[PDB]
């Protein structure tokens, strides 16, 4: 694993000392080399999981996130290469360093076994994000947004830690697969119930429900492309991975400790998908769509069925990539205009003839057009939920419909009307942003082709 | 669709518009042009009957009864004119009706060909900046402090010089 980390810990001094004319290219290409080397984990010949020490490990549920992160790093770099163009070399170097620290932390956590290490990394993820969001935004409320982000996250963090302590004491160790081979069952009293809470509350507060979805839009809006990318892609996924790895112990509590959370997740999926219709701000629309899909993820995580877990992982990866892509497109249309509003720029596709086909290929992946990992996940999760009850296809379908609606609303208020006549600032497409779109897409094709990699624990 | 209307209207134009609308809906009801001519002549007689009258009372009464009769005996699916709203060509070509300023961002390897036309753009824009500032004073001098204006636009009271605000009208692409 050091083979993945150490070079990512060398990109930093590399950035510091390299000359301005060359740091961008050098660090970018070498981060791509890191992404490449990050595939050794896929030599999972047999079912014996990979273990490198008492301090690291890998797994089928973690490897995807690792590669996706090591591959979203350079895309953040590139998408962060036209703005802050008049900001000093030292400042842009700081930005690069923060991105790289995010990468390294995310890798170490998605790999680590001991949930306490996982937790310290899960909470160290903040500093770079808070910074990136406050020191490089474009509005004023970014401050309140960062505050909300930080404090939601830490409120979650605390009882999680307290329960990790209670465990480490009652049980002997915290190492995973030992928690498995020596788990037990609980008398199911108010004590163990509040323990279940203090263990899942943080992961949920992070992966937003209806009740606490508030810090997502502010972040994705006030913050720049890279922060938006990384939020929509991974910093949510951390909660899901933690919940998956930890729920192994709390059996059986999660049968009746789920109804409220499943209910909230579904209702929130619906209401947020509806708001996605009448939400002006494009990035806010995208954020609420992300909420709508992560609600499915959660409803599939709780009930603990194998189909459900595989669908969760599929939809997870798919949404990560697709949201990064949509945010790239938004930023693109913003740098030329400097207004997030959806109804200002209209009737494109007459001057950006190609870009549309990078807009289209995203929506179709949002509304679950097959053959896509998106629909595979949505469908397996709907199957699990139908088994768990026959009266949830209702909500699945309402969500599918409202999505099929607002995805096209977005396509049609930006690439289907008639062109304005005062947007003389429409610098044509840059090879760079076209490349970012292509790189976010192509992997969707290859994974639609061969998804056995992207299944999960149960496959 | 170039000139703009006044705020208020007059009995004259109201009656004219009612007439044209009713005649179109009649062309739609009664297909054959012979029947259309017949009933159009009948409507013309109906109008010429009360034409010479001038009492605002009878005017308003007849107009507001005429509009009700019209709305109650109109054609559900009328005859829309393709090139106008409601039709099957309205905006059909707006997807191709690009403006000019897309030109500037061409690449020189492309405007290499089509050289002549780009030899004349400059002397056109040159025909704009050289006579822009003047087009402002013509209004800022005649921006009557009375402050009660319409949307009309005065011409170049001088000779040789060009009018004001010709860019957003000239260069408007074709209809095709």
């Amino acid at each position: 694993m050091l083979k993945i980390i150490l070079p990512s810990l060398m990109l930093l001094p590399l950035t510091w000392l390299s000359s301005p004319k060359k740091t961008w290219t050098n660090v970018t290409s070498y981060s791509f080399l890191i992404s490449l080397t990050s595939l050794t984990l896929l030599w999972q010949t047999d079912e014996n999981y990979k273990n490198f020490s008492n301090m690291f490990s890998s797994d089928p549920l973690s490897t995807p996130l690792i590669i996706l992160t090591a591959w979203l790093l350079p895309l953040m770099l590139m998408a962060s290469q036209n703005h802050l163009k008049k900001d000093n070399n030292v400042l842009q170097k700081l930005y690069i360093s923060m991105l790289i620290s995010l990468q390294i932390l995310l890798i170490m956590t998605f790999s680590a076994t001991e949930l306490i290490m996982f937790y310290i990394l899960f909470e160290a993820t903040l500093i770079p994000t808070l910074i990136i969001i406050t020191r490089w935004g474009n509005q004023t409320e970014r401050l309140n947004a960062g505050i909300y982000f930080l404090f939601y996250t830490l409120i979650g963090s605390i009882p999680l830690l307290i329960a990790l302590i209670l465990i480490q004491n009652h049980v002997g160790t915290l190492n995973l697969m030992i928690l498995s081979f020596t788990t037990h069952t609980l008398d199911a009293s108010w004590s163990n119930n509040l323990l279940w809470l203090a263990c899942m509350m943080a992961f949920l507060i992070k992966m937003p429900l209806y009740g606490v979805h508030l810090w997502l839009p502010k972040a994705h809006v006030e913050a720049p492309i890279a922060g938006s990318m990384i939020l929509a892609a991974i910093l949510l996924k951390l909660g899901s991975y933690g919940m998956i790895r930890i729920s192994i112990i709390l059996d059986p509590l999660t049968k009746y400790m789920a109804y409220p959370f499943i209910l909230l997740s579904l209702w929130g999926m619906i209401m947020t998908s509806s708001i996605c219709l009448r939400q002006t701000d494009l990035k806010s629309l995208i954020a609420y769509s992300s909420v709508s899909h992560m609600a499915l993820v959660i409803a599939s995580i709780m009930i603990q069925t194998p189909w459900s877990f595989m669908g969760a992982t599929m939809l997870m990866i798919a949404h990560g990539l697709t949201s990064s892509l949509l945010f790239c497109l938004a930023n693109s249309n913003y740098e030329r205009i400097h207004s997030r509003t959806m109804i200002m720029a209209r009737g494109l596709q007459m001057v950006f003839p190609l870009m549309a086909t990078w807009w289209l290929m995203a929506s179709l992946a949002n509304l679950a057009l097959p053959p896509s990992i998106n629909l595979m996940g949505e469908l397996f999760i709907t199957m699990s939920l139908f088994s768990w009850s026959n009266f949830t296809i209702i909500l699945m379908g309402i969500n599918i419909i409202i999505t099929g609606m607002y995805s096209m609303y977005m396509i049609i208020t930006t690439q289907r009307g008639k062109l304005t006549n005062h947007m003389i600032n429409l610098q044509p497409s840059h090879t760079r942003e076209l490349t970012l779109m292509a790189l976010h897409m192509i992997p969707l094709i290859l994974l639609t082709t061969s998804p056995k990699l992207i299944t999960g624990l149960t496959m | 669709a170039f000139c703009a209307p006044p705020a208020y209207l007059t009995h004259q134009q109201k009656v004219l518009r009612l007439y044209k609308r009713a005649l179109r809906h009649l062309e739609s009801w009664c297909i054959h042009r012979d029947k259309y001519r017949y009933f159009a002549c009948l409507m013309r007689a109906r109008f010429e009957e009360h034409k010479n009258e001038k009492d605002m009372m009878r005017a308003t009464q007849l107009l507001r009864e005429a509009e009700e009769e019209f709305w109650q005996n109109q054609h559900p699916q009328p005859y829309i004119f393709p090139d106008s709203p409601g039709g099957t060509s309205f905006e059909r070509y707006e997807c191709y009706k690009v403006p000019e300023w897309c030109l500037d961002y061409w690449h020189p390897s492309e405007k290499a060909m089509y050289p002549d036309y780009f030899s004349k753009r400059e002397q056109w824009k040159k025909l704009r900046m050289e006579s822009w500032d003047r087009e402002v004073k013509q209004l800022q001098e005649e921006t009557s402090p009375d402050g009660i204006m319409t949307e009309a636009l005065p011409p170049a009271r001088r000779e040789g010089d060009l009018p004001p605000l010709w860019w957003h009208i000239v260069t408007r692409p074709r209809e095709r």
């Binding site: 003839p353 090879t431 | 403006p99 030109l103 961002y105 492309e110």
Partner: peptide, 11 residues
């Protein structure tokens, strides 16, 4: 034989 206005397309 007339012109046809269009965007860049080279990029």
């Amino acid at each position: 034989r007339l012109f046809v206005v269009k965007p860049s397309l080279y990029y």
